[PDB]
From Swiss-Prot:
Organism: Streptomyces venezuelae
Record's keyword terms, sorted: Antibiotic biosynthesis, Heme, Iron, Metal-binding, Monooxygenase, Oxidoreductase
Cofactor(s) needed for function: heme
GO biological process, one term: macrolide biosynthetic process
Gene (UniProt): pikC
Name used for this protein in its record: Cytochrome P450 monooxygenase PikC
Pathway: Antibiotic biosynthesis
């Protein structure tokens, strides 16, 4: 049959794991209907999830999908995440040097400065209370990526409204309108760099496209700006929020980290394992019928690798539902796996590490200012994210 995910309401959005685990008991692949009405395949179970993410039979090029693209969707589609080799290879090579650990490490002073200023403003609240999402989780990643790419400050607010419509639109037409608006804005921003001799990443990309259109077409120039600004926004925002929620709702772990801040890196890894922002990977399309344990997924269908269920597979992560900052987290799929492994992983880790350390060191008696049952989780099947994260201190 086809399991209806939308018929489970906020209960599934808040705690989807028993649903996924139930399906994994029956097999690796399952036809479901998303809360928004999309008929898709779910791939569950760690070993299968990891294998499918790197299986070249599961393409990311939309030319291999039987799902139609709107005009707005197609305009942003020429990007590395929605490509196979050789196009994926050519596109990622253009910006790979920008995101290595060595290069990202040169951003640590600026990231620390951004975090310091945002925490300063948060601590200015007289009642010692704040929404962590608004105070730190949203502004930090959009500030970093905007300075790297060259998005002027007055333009960034509208950018966050758009990506919000991508995840939780009030209706499907609102997602379409935001896509057309972001496409129009990005093309204008690309135009504004032309001939201005800027040294931001977008300025270099415009130059690259202009002097050889076969190395980076104008559609791919637009798609590159788009994917670099969008792919890391909702993810990094929700890693900080989900991770802080994990720390604040497991007080034993918060105390362990407070008493030994060298556990920080291992704690961020477990935040990725336990409550990573990517619940399911982006769309994959079998180039041919693929047999998964007697379940055959036909060519062109939409396949979602449920990363969240892979991280709760007991054979791979023993005692899966325990948030343990000292856990062996090696092999988690929070950044994906294969040729599409997150290009921004060093940057995301840098932002998350600095953000967590700042809160723990500068918010005395930091605590969750609402009950976990009162939190509201967004129902998007790809993103695990909170509506807000009320906190208190002092
Ligand atoms: C906590 C933060 C992040 C998480 C959990 C995350 C997660 C992921 C995942 C799971 C994928 C692969 C998706 C798929 O296979 O379906 C991916 C790819 C990608 N991510 Fe991230 N990401 C994060 C941060 C960032 C940041 C900050 C940037 C911006 C520079 C970024 C840029 C990208 C790009 C461009 C790709 C596509 C790479 C390619 O296809 O080779 N990510 N990310
Ligand atoms: C790092 C990959 C991201 O997904 C995207 O960037 C897809 C391509 C995009 O449609 C974005 C806009 C899809 C929406 C639902 C989003 O914010 C989700 C997810 C991340 C997993």
């Amino acid at each position: 049959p086809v399991l209806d995910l939308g018929a489970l309401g906020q209960d599934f959005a808040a705690d989807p794991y028993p649903t996924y685990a139930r399906l994994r008991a029956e097999g690796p692949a399952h036809r479901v209907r998303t809360p928004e009405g999309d008929e898709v395949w779910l791939v569950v179970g760690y070993d299968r999830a990891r294998a499918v993410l790197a299986d070249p039979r599961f393409s990311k090029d939309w030319r291999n999908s039987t799902t139609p693209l709107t005009e707005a969707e197609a305009a942003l589609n020429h990007n590395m995440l929605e490509s196979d080799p050789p196009r994926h290879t050519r596109l990622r090579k253009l910006v790979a040097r920008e995101f290595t650990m060595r290069r990202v490490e040169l951003l640590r002073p600026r990231v620390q400065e951004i975090v310091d200023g945002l925490v300063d403003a948060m601590l200015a609240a007289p009642d010692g209370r704040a929404d962590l999402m608004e105070s730190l989780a949203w502004p930090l990643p959009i500030t970093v990526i905007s300075e790297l790419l060259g998005v002027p400050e007055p333009d960034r607010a509208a950018f966050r409204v758009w990506t919000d419509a991508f995840v939780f639109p009030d209706d499907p037409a609102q997602a379409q309108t935001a896509m057309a608006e972001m496409s129009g804005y990005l093309s204008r921003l690309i135009d504004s760099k032309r001939g201005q001799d800027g040294e931001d990443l977008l300025s270099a990309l415009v130059r690259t496209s202009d002097e050889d259109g076969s190395r980076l077409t104008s559609e791919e120039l637009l798609g590159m700006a788009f994917i670099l600004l969008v792919a890391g926004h909702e993810t990094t925002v929700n890693l900080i929020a989900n991770g802080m929620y994990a720390l604040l709702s497991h007080p034993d772990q918060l105390a362990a980290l407070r008493a030994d801040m060298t556990l920080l890196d291992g704690a961020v890894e477990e935040m990725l394992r336990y409550e990573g922002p990517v619940e399911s990977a982006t769309y994959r399309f079998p180039v041919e019928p693929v047999d998964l344990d007697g379940t055959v997924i036909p060519a062109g269908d939409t396949v979602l690798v449920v990363l969240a269920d892979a991280h709760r597979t007991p054979e791979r992560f023993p005692d899966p539902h325990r948030f343990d900052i000292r856990r062996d987290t090696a092999g988690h799929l929070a950044f994906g796996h294969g040729i599409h492994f997150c290009i921004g992983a060093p940057l995301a880790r840098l932002e998350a590490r600095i953000a967590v350390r700042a809160l723990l060191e500068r918010c005395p008696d930091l605590a969750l200012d609402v009950s976990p049952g009162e939190l509201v989780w967004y129902p998007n099947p790809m993103i695990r994210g909170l509506k807000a994260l009320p906190i208190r201190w002092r």
